Amino acid sequence: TASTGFAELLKDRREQVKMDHAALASLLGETPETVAAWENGEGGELTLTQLGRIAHVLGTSIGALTPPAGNDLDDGVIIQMPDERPILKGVRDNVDYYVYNCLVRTKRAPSLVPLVVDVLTDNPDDAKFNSGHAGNEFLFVLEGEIHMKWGDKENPKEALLPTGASMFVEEHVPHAFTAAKGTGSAKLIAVNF
Amino acid sequence: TASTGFAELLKDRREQVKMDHAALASLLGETPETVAAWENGEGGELTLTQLGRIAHVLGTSIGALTPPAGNDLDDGVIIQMPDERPILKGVRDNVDYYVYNCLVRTKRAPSLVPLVVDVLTDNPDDAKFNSGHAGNEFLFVLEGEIHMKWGDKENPKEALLPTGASMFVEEHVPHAFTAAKGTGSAKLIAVNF
Amino acid sequence: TASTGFAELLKDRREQVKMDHAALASLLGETPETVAAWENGEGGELTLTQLGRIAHVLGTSIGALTPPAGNDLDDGVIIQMPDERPILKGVRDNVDYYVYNCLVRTKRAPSLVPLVVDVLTDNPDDAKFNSGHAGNEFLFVLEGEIHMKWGDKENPKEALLPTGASMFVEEHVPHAFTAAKGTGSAKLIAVNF
Amino acid sequence: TASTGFAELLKDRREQVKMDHAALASLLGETPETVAAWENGEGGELTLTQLGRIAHVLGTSIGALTPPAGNDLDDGVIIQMPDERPILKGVRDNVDYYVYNCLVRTKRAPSLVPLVVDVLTDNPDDAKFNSGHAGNEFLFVLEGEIHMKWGDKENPKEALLPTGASMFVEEHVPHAFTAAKGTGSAKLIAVNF
Numbered sequence A, B, C, D: 001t002a003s004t005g006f007a008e009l010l011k012d013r014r015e016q017v018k019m020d021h022a023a024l025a026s027l028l029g030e031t032p033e034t035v036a037a038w039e040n041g042e043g044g045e046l047t048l049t050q051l052g053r054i055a056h057v058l059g060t061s062i063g064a065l066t067p068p069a070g071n072d073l074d075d076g077v078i079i080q081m082p083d084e085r086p087i088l089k090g091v092r093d094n095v096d097y098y099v100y101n102c103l104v105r106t107k108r109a110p111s112l113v114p115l116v117v118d119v120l121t122d123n124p125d126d127a128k129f130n131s132g133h134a135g136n137e138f139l140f141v142l143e144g145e146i147h148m149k150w151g152d153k154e155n156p157k158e159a160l161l162p163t164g165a166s167m168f169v170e171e172h173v174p175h176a177f178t179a180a181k182g183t184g185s186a187k188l189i190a191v192n193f
């Protein structure tokens, strides 16, 4: 089906730009039958590069010729239990900064990446900024008091957030968190979308 | 500025469809000076209906002629403290079903509506479905055990979710929650986007 | 209607951000009955600025609250006869540069603005550049020979185009046209989509 | 390159969903070194199906992982001469119905497919409907008189269009053309955007 979505999108496009197997094969240096093969479902083994070419000849992108991520929902829903969360230990400059408890995701919303981040450090002076990232992010202070930092890492803005505080960080904005000074650690809910 | 964004978008469009004050005024039954007035910043008092017409004559929509919601961020961020959350008591069939503790919102993401919902009822048999709503929603079980229901209200699907469970409910999918049977109540984090 | 579209959309939004009449009415300095009235179609008299405030209060834009341009097609089609097309003389620096013969348009595609442009001047050295414009444009040399100029007005790239040539000009790219030198006039058919 | 675009995009995604090489490599039955290799441009040989799996595992689509069609403009412009335009004979039911004279196209606007269509038949009763097609279309009667048909092939609406007429056909709406009866042939200029 990753080879079927292609079979038809290739056809949609070939006809969209007004070509035929013979005409297309020619720009790609392939037999007119080869092409028809792809349009059947035999495109499965085409290499990434080969797809870069095909997309090119048809003046479009690989993405346009491939199918969208399938649908992984059970009647519009998808659940995840606490003990099935993927865990990722985050380390910045050989320091256990965060711990990512990845929450439920769906191919129907590829950009939605929910997380429960354990903020390990509690020394604001050593907060480590990222360079910011694409996608707006909504945060919620689960437990503890969070020490937030955003903007220019050199002279950034700050905020002390109590449990229950809710934040929004526009995409590309650099930011960093730590537990409140000396308080040990805090927990957070970060939802990227 | 709700009258300025208009002043220029009106101009952008008038010229976009190749008209002049005189030509435009004519389709609207207005003086050529009236129009120029609007394009200055004097459009402020134009009624909704009057705007429905102007958009029509210019074969576009009111929205296209009005400015986007401003920007309400402090260097890409916006915080909200626990004691400044708007509260809305939800009642279904004269029953205190939920309680909406509205979290941080931003005009930069008009669709993002974060909530902390208190699920008051604990009798799954009397769960009240909505008709579903636009926008995907991410849920997280804050406290208690949640009894979820989705799909057809008559013969719906169910799920018992422990604290920490995370769900996703595709837009338009009907759903309902209650505390686990007899457990009194549960708390949830619902993020619509 | 605009007052009906607004009445349905306003209700949706209010409910989205979890506000009841009372709640919304407060932030606006209005009475719950007034807000209920609006959702009942009685909002047509609302000025552009109050709509701007209502929008802001509901943390969104006026467009989100107003209805789509609407549909003016006839079973999916909209036709226009040669004799019924709008005209606009384009003068630049006190010299008739173009004449715009506006072709079919539609609310189902506002961004689409097709035209038949009469290139009046025939002296390249006195070409008059535009500043570029939102939206891409497709052109077709109808009659005569066109001498196209695009890019930096103080140093443009050029191309002499014969009848039948077709070109694409990405948005916000500046460009200018004139008939081939001495040839008097040329004719294009521009399509802004 | 496709292998470079994929290499940069793959890295972004992996980091987005909070997976390290090891984590991703596992779900794919590959070694951490292999995954690191891909992010290092060495992924060109990957077949369409593995790309489909890698995509799926990263809960997204192949397109999200591949680069944009690319840019083929010349300082914002792309030109095409009359003699260099592609041609495709359109036969329906064993009868030459159209001849497609493909105009300029671009990767910066794949959806844009302009054409000069020669309407070969001149008998309305034997019109050959298409099934409609994605994307809206703008038409212009170049030569002759066109006898347009759209809608339900078993009961179409009709319109005789003189040279210079312009029409819009919303996407997925079926339509057919033929020269005015007996007039031999007509000429259109179709633009699918």
Ligand SMILES: C[C@@H](O)CP(=O)(O)O
Pocket: A117, A130, A133, A137, A175, A177, A188, A190
């Ligand atoms: C809370 C989380 O957003 C921090 P980072 O992963 O973006 O650096």
Ligand SMILES: C[C@@H](O)CP(=O)(O)O
Pocket: B117, B130, B133, B137, B175, B177, B188, B190
């Ligand atoms: C949890 C929340 O989404 C229930 P409803 O407000 O959509 O009915």
Ligand SMILES: C[C@@H](O)CP(=O)(O)O
Pocket: C117, C130, C133, C137, C175, C177, C188, C190
């Ligand atoms: C041909 C036409 O696009 C010239 P301008 O109206 O954009 O200045």
Ligand SMILES: C[C@@H](O)CP(=O)(O)O
Pocket: D117, D130, D133, D137, D175, D177, D188, D190
């Ligand atoms: C004029 C052209 O649009 C006819 P078809 O190619 O869509 O069938």
